[PDB]
Design a protein around this ligand. Structure first.
Ligand SMILES: [Mg+2]
Lengths: 100, 138, 101, 181, 66, 132, 86, 131, 196
């Protein structure tokens, strides 16, 4: 319990310092908190968590087609792909496959 | 024998508004190497003496942050690798500076902050009472 | 070009959740108090339950950004323990060493 | 007793740097700073001194050529504050509507072929072209002699031609002010 | 490990020459630059926190090294 | 038996560099960090974004100077600047090295929106610390 | 020539020396004149300052430095001049 | 010189092209490291020291009282009742949010204004007059 | 043939040169440009630390070759021009807080990366003693009842920390605004205060 003077004083301080002045229960003070920060989804760590993998692969792919980047991994996989084709183990054409 | 002539000096315009006063100006620096913080202390304390600033230095105690990880890709829960990150400190306590002295000195020591070193510059500025607080409105 | 389809499904979840965050915030605020009438809060319940399911932020998963692993990720680096260690053990993470004491 | 509070000196954002550069004179043991400082990359003749700087500049054109040819790979601003000069450049007019404002783009973008083609269509529409707008279009056509400035990738004799478009445009121009002449 | 006597003498030469450059950088008298001044200067110019001292940068007389 | 970043002993004939010759329990003891920034210091931010940048650059440089690098990159950051300190070999034309320095620097500065420099240090052959 | 060079080195005047062609021409001529009309000791001072710090010589300007060394009867330096020539 | 210049008139191609080659006069290769830091600072590539963590951010030139005092925007809402109570919590929280611009804050407030304006009937049934 | 590397220029360096010209700014250790026979590396058994050339250990040091004592003194001479003088009247901290009762704290955060932003920079702290203000008994009581724990009785300092606003500018302005309206309200005597 708080005296009327103690009560009317803490309400005056709250008005001054910009805190809630109406009596508000703890369940409704979430409204203040909700608008007092950013939504989790809006925070940079969240929406910008992943590197743009579309940009890192597409950039380094043209840099290889341009001759300015050597992709030892893609060279490896091309060689294997070339050999499998010789063995006859080539990818079938989509749709026009063995089955109907 | 080819020494240049008429060395052009930068324009330092003395203005007519007064200058900020800093009661003190604490400069904490944080690195992973202590020898690097020793060389940065030597540099910054000398730079302050060659500029007529009063400077004191102490070492705040270090922080060692450790965490554990699994050592294997799949099972073997009893086997861990543990890692740490040490943060070492040195606080440069400068005192009684004017805004322009600070401005020059910070810029200088900040541009020569070594790789892997961070700095937190607390500036305690001196100020006088706002006009509206001189006398009540009652 | 993401590591896999599970990462790709999280990339989309994170993006949709960002698009709707302001709407979701506003609707929650209505239904997160005792001030407003319940007939109104009940409408809000319906409204936010009708927003696309992939805008719900609890459906975001913090996967290794390099290998897409859904567990064992350190949040400061967004990497799985396998990937973190590989860089840490080669000396490639600034200031991170093996701990002994 | 009274605080003798001094006055705030001010300077430019390069001044302290310049104050520090004053303290150093060039190094005689070193080649110019634009070169790499390795015993094996240090130029060892005037020919190399020239050739090595062209190679470095050649690689920069290839970079700038890629950066401007694939803008999407370089449209993610991480810098604070924003650096306008490390962004890609866009040289194609983005407004296809026939309007006075759209004319300025082709003029500002020094696109001689786009401007004349748009000017022809615009003239057929019968819309009025401002004198200032027409004057600016003339400067571009005359300055380069109706020859498109070549950029990235897609002498002896008289280069001027009597049957050139610049001459024709003046005839079509209804009003010719002093700047036109 | 094959360090010919000639090899060492070329090392002592380089140390003496380097000793003088080090005193010059540090703004000290080349004629009174002791080893303890070499160590203090090298520690400042190449700061390393490596916990092992034998792994840190060093500039010693070739006879104390080889 | 531990495996991480250990080069095994073999038959006394394997050239290894000082970097390769040291196991992870020597990373603050007998050798340093191949990168230096402030992200992993107490109270600092963006350790993740620094780490993704460092994984790309090492990959970028390895394929951009194919067969030239003689050791690992040293990545440095000072404020807004980024320094790439490579040790390369002396087999490529210095014309080609200058092309690649100018190219990489430019391309990386527009990609990571910062001033990026690249300091080469040529060696004749890969510096051998030990024959494992 | 010392007045011409003296002017270039004042303030920010050195920025007017122009492209590489202009720069070699300037320093090539300037130094030829030094070797011919200057004391040998001061020619060696200008030799060390200008090359390769500011100017990569031409084949000729080595000859002039040789001749100036002969006129000064300082042949103990010719060895050094050969190394630099390479 | 001429008393009154043609300030309204703007430079032409000839003008700027001449300005470009007036600069080519003094352009020389960078001489040392200081010159590159100086060149980069002029180009805006390098940070300016001593650093301000808000260098480049002026926050739409807003003043403190536009973030902190948001009741002026509640003038279209009921002056009393549950809507006032509620909106007084939105603005209290908004007035404490250092991550939003004043424009973003006003968007939140304006949403609730449009939102409660659509639920008039719901609000009228519960005897809360909106307008 | 195969291009041969020139000799290091450390040989052409004079033992008395001015070293600041060689390394004017912060730059990575170059063996070919540093005339020191410095070795680094944990030695193999019956071996020596490794030579400077190709030594990746020396390239991992953030060196101080651009900041020798010579260089520093030279630098600071050119910078004395930029700095102004401390008011000789403000000798002691006693005199500082006599003439300047308010103190404003703020922090700047220097960190490496592409972005300079740091949300901790916005915070402003306003510190003042209540003995430096024009407060009677009445008002000194109400000011202390209004600020709560922002006031320390031991030191008599009232501390106002503000961080509501995006900018430090705006927060400082708010901190002053608060000290102001706190001072004027502590002087106003509402009628309900007779219920104490
Ligand atoms: Mg084990």
């Amino acid at each position: 319990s708080l005296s009327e003077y103690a009560f009317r004083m803490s309400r005056l301080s709250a008005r001054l310092f910009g805190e809630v002045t109406r009596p508000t229960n703890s369940k409704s003070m979430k409204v203040v908190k909700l608008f007092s920060e950013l939504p989790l989804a809006k925070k940079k760590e969240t929406y910008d968590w992943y590197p743009n993998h579309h940009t890192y692969a597409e950039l380094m792919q043209t840099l290889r087609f341009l001759g300015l980047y050597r992709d030892e991994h893609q060279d490896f996989m091309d060689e294997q792909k070339r050999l499998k084709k010789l063995r006859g183990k080539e990818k079938p054409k989509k749709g026009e496959g063995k089955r109907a | 024998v080819d020494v240049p002539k008429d060395l052009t000096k930068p324009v330092v315009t003395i203005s007519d508004e007064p200058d900020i006063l800093y009661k003190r100006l604490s400069v904490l620096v944080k690195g992973h190497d202590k020898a690097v913080l020793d060389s940065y202390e030597y540099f910054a304390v000398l730079a302050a003496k060659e500029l007529g600033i009063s400077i004191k230095v102490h070492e705040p105690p270090r922080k060692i942050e450790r965490f554990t990880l699994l050592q294997s890709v799949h099972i073997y829960k009893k086997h861990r690798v543990q890692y740490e990150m040490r943060t070492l400190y040195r606080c440069l306590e400068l005192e009684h500076l004017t805004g322009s002295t600070a401005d020059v000195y910070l810029e200088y020591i900040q541009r020569n902050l070594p790789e892997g070193v961070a700095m937190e510059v607390t500036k305690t500025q001196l100020e006088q009472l706002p006009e509206h607080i001189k006398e009540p409105i009652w | 070009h993401y590591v896999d389809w599970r990462m790709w499904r999280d990339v989309k979840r994170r993006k949709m959740a960002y698009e709707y965050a302001d709407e979701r915030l506003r609707i929650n605020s209505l239904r997160k108090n005792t001030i407003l009438p319940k007939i109104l809060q009940d409408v809000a319940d319906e409204e936010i339950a009708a927003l696309p399911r992939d805008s719900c932020p609890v459906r975001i998963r913090n996967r290794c950004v390099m290998t897409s692993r859904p567990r064992g990720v350190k949040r400061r680096w967004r990497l799985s323990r396998i990937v973190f260690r590989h860089l840490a053990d080669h000396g490639q993470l600034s200031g991170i060493q093996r701990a002994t004491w | 007793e009274e605080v003798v509070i001094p006055k705030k000196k001010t300077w430019d954002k390069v001044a302290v740097l310049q104050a520090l550069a004053s303290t150093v004179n060039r190094d005689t043991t070193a080649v110019p700073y634009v070169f790499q400082d390795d015993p094996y990359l240090m130029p060892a003749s005037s020919l190399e001194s020239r050739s090595f700087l062209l190679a470095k500049k050649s690689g920069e054109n290839v970079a700038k050529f890629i950066i401007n040819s694939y803008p999407k790979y370089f449209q993610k601003d991480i810098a604070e504050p924003h650096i306008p000069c490390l962004m890609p450049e866009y040289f194609e007019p983005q407004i296809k509507d026939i309007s006075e404002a759209a004319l300025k783009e082709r003029i500002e973008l020094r696109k001689v072929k786009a401007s004349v083609d748009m000017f022809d269509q615009l003239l057929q529409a019968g819309t009025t072209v401002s004198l200032e707008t027409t004057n600016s279009l003339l400067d571009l056509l005359c300055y380069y002699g109706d020859q498109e400035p070549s950029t990235d990738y897609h002498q002896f004799g008289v280069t001027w031609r009597a049957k050139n478009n610049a001459e024709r445009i003046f005839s079509l121009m209804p009003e010719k002010n002093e700047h036109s002449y | 490990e094959t360090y010919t006597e000639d090899f060492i003498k070329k090392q002592i030469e380089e140390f003496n020459i380097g000793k003088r450059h080090l005193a010059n950088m540090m703004g000290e008298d080349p004629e009174t630059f002791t080893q303890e001044d070499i160590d203090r200067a090298i520690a400042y110019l190449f700061p390393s926190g490596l916990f092992e001292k034998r792994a840190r940068p060093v500039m010693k007389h070739p006879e104390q090294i080889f | 038996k531990n495996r991480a970043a250990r080069v095994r002993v073999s038959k006394g004939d394997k050239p290894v560099t000082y970097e390769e010759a040291h196991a992870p329990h020597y990373i603050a003891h007998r050798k340093g960090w191949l990168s230096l920034h402030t992200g992993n210091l107490d109270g600092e931010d963006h350790a993740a974004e620094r780490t993704v940048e460092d994984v790309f650059l090492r990959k970028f440089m390895w394929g951009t100077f194919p067969g030239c690098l003689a050791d690992q990159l040293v990545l440095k950051r000072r404020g807004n600047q980024l320094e790439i300190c490579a040790v390369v070999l002396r087999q490529l034309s210095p014309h080609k090295y200058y092309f690649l320095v100018g190219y990489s620097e430019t391309l990386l500065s527009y990609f990571y929106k910062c001033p990026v420099r690249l300091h080469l240090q040529t060696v004749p052959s890969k510096v051998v610390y030990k024959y494992l | 020539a010392y007045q011409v060079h003296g002017l270039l080195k004042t303030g920010d005047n050195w920025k007017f020396i122009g492209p590489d062609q202009h720069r070699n021409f300037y320093y090539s001529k300037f130094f030829d004149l030094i070797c011919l009309m200057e004391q040998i000791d001061v020619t060696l001072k200008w030799y060390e300052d200008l090359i390769p710090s500011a100017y990569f010589p031409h084949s000729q300007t080595m000859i002039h430095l040789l001749q100036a060394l002969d006129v000064a009867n300082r042949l103990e330096v010719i060895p050094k001049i050969w190394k630099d020539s390479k | 010189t001429k008393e009154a210049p043609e300030t309204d008139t703007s430079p032409s191609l000839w003008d700027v092209e001449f300005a470009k080659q007036l600069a080519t006069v003094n352009e020389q290769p960078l001489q040392n490291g200081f010159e590159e830091l100086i060149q980069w600072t002029k180009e805006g590539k390098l940070w300016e020291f001593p650093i301000n963590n808000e260098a480049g951010f002026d926050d739409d030139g807003s003043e403190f009282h536009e973030h902190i005092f948001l009741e002026k925007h509640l003038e279209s809402f009921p002056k009393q009742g549950p809507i006032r109570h509620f909106m007084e919590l939105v603005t209290c929280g908004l007035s404490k949010n250092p991550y939003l611009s004043v424009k973003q804050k006003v968007e939140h407030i304006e949403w609730f204004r449009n939102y409660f304006n659509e639920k008039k009937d719901i609000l009228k049934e519960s005897n809360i007059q909106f307008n | 043939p195969r291009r041969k590397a020139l000799p290091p220029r450390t040989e052409k360096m004079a033992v008395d040169q001015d070293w600041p010209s060689v390394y004017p700014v912060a730059a990575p250790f170059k063996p070919s440009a540093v005339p020191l026979p410095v070795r680094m590396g944990y030695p193999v058994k019956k071996g020596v630390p490794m030579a400077k050339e190709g030594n990746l250990e020396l390239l991992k040091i953030p060196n101080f070759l651009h900041l020798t004592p010579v260089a520093i003194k030279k630098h600071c001479e050119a910078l004395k021009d930029f700095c102004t003088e401390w008011p000789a009247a403000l000798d002691s901290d006693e005199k500082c807080e006599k003439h300047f009762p308010i103190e404003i704290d703020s922090t700047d955060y220097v960190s490496s990366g592409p972005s300079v932003r740091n949300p901790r920079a916005r915070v402003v702290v306003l510190r003042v003693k209540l003995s430096s203000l024009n407060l009677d008994d009445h008002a000194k009581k109400k000011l202390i009842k209004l600020v709560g724990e922002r006031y320390c009785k031991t030191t008599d300092v009232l501390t106002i920390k503000t961080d509501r606003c995006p900018l430090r500018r705006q927060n400082y302005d708010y901190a002053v605004y608060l000290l102001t309206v706190l001072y004027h309200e502590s002087w106003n005597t509402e009628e309900w205060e007779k219920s104490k």
